[PDB]
Amino acid sequence: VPISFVFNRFPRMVRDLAKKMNKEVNFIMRGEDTELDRTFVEEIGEPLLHLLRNAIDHGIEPKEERIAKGKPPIGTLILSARHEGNNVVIEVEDDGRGIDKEKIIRKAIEKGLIDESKAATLSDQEILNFLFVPGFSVGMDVVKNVVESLNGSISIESEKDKGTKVTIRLPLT
Amino acid sequence: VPISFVFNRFPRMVRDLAKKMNKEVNFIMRGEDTELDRTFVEEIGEPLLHLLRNAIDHGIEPKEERIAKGKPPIGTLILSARHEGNNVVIEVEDDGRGIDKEKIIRKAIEKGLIDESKAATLSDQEILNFLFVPGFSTGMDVVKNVVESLNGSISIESEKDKGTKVTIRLPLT
Ligand SMILES: Cn1cnc2c(N)ncnc21
Ligand SMILES: Cn1cnc2c(N)ncnc21
C-alpha cells in the first residue's frame, strides 16, 4: 500500500489546526509513494495525526512569539517516509519550541520516578523517553503502544528553541 | 585530585595485559590533569580497568589480523578525560573489531528477551544496551553498576571493524 492513502488526508487537517491555534505552518510531505504492508498504513494514521497535532500545538509557536524569538514567522512541519533496507522510517519534524528536558527531569523527580542525585548525568534519550510513561504530562504512551504492536520502534530527538523530530521505524512486512 | 592518580597505573596494566594476550597495543592517555572529587578518584579505577581489559581482549585484533584486514598494523587504545560543564567525561576508545550487533540480537533472541520481528527495527543504542543486561555476556552490567553508584551515566558506541567507544559521564559532586 502506498502510505499516501494516509498522508493525503493530512494537509487539510494540519492547516485547519494551524488556523484554529493561530499559527502559520508550512507543511511539507516527502516520500508519500513509500509502500509498505497495508496493515501498517491502516494503523499508523492515528498515531501520526497525534504527532502532527503535538507539533502544531506544543511545538510551533504563534507568529508573534516566533518573531519575538527572532525565528522565521512561518513554522515548518515535515512528515516523511522512506525505505531504509527492509524497514520504513517515518519522521515528523518541526522547527518549534522543542521539548524542555529540564522540565521533564523536574516532573520525573516530582512524580517519584527518579532521584535528584541521578539526574545530573541522565542521557538525552533516557530523559525524552519519560514522555512515553502514561501518567506523564491519544497520548504519547498510546503512540508508542501502537508502534510496538506493529513490531516497530519510536524515538524522539529535540533541542530547546530549535524543534523536535519523532522517528518511527516499521518493518516492511 | 587529578585523575592521573588513577590513570598513572594503567600503562603498566595495559602492557601486562597486551603481553599476556599476545596483542600489540598503542596506548594513549589524554586529559590526565583533569581534576575531580576524591570519591570518584578512588572508585573509578576498577570500571576503567574493566573497559581497558575489554578493549585489549575482545577489541584490538592481533597485528597479523589487522594487516590482513588492511588496518594500521598496531591497534590503538585511547583513554581520555575532560571537563564538560560541571561534569567530567571519560572515554575509552579502541580501533579494533567492534561489537557484532547481529551476534547481540541472536543472543537476545536465544535468551528470550526479544522475538525476531521486533529485532528488525531496534536502533543501534537499543541493540548495544543489551550488553548492560546482567549476565548478558554472563561484563558491562558490572561497569554500569559502579558508574551508577557514582550517579554517573555510561554509553557505548561501536561498529563492526571500526572499533568501540565507551563514554562515562560523572557529576563531579
Ligand atoms: C511535549 N511535546 C510533545 N511533542 C512536542 C513537540 N513536537 N514540540 C514541543 N513539545 C512537544
Ligand atoms: C563485548 N565487548 C565489550 N567491549 C568490547 C570492545 N571494546 N570491543 C569488542 N567487543 C567488546
- For residue A125, the domain's CATH number is 3.30.565.10
Domain span at A28: 1-173
Sheet with B87-94, edge to edge strand ranges: B25-30, B75-84, B87-94, B163-170, B153-159
d(CA A22, CA B67): 63
From A148, which residue of chain B is nearest by alpha-carbon distance? B118
d(CA A94, CA A156): 12
Check if B125 contacts A (Cβ < 8 Å): yes
Q: How many CB atoms neighbour CB A75 within 10 A? A: 25
Question: What burial class does residue A2 get, using C-beta atoms within 10 Å of its C-beta: 0-12 exposed, 13-18 middle, 19+ buried?
Answer: middle
DSSP per position, A19-30: HHTT--EEEEEE
Instruction: Give the nearest partner residue to B151 out of A86, A118, A155, using CB atoms.
Output: A118
Residue that has been written with the C-alpha cell 533516557 in this structure? A126
Length of chain A: 173
CB A75 within 8 A of CB A24: yes
Check if B122 contacts A (Cβ < 8 Å): yes
Closest residue by Cα to residue A151 from A37, A48, A23: A37
Domain count, chain A: 1
Choice from B99, B104, B130 to test ligand 2 binding pocket (greatest atom count within 8 A of CB): B99
Exposed e or buried b per residue across B77-114, where buried means at least 16 C-beta atoms within 10 angstroms of its C-beta: bbbbbeeeeebbbbbbbbbbbbbebeebbebbeeeeee
Q: Across the A/B interface, how many CB contacts are shorter than 8 Å?
A: 41
Contact between chains at B173 and A120 (C-beta distance less than 8 A): yes
Ligand closest to B75 (CA) is: 2
Check if A123 contacts B (Cβ < 8 Å): yes
Choice from B58, B159, B167, B168 to test ligand 2 binding pocket (greatest atom count within 8 A of CB): B58
Show the DSSP H helices in B44-123 as ranges: 45-54, 63-68, 101-110, 116-119
Q: How many CB atoms neighbour CB B1 within 10 A? A: 12
Residue that has been written with the C-alpha cell 504512551 in this structure? A141
Atom of ligand 2 nearest to the CA of B55: 7
B:90-119 residues touching chain A, CB 8 A cutoff: 117-118
Contact between chains at A169 and B117 (C-beta distance less than 8 A): no
CA angle B121, B127, B133 (to 5 degrees): 135
Cα–Cα distances in angstroms (integers) from residue A108 to residues A30, A113, B137, in the given order: 35, 5, 32
CA A76 to chain centre: 13
Resolution (A): 2.0
Distance (Å) from the C-alpha of residue A17 to the closest C-alpha of chain B?
32
Chain A residues with beta carbon closer than 8 angstroms to that of B118: 148, 151
Chain A residues with beta carbon closer than 8 angstroms to that of B155: 123
Interface mutation vs chain A, best among B44, B87, B121, most A CBs within 10 Å: B121
Residue that has been written with the C-alpha cell 587504545 in this structure? B77
Closest residue by Cα to residue A96 from A76, A78, A124: A76
Q: Which amino acid is at A155?
A: S
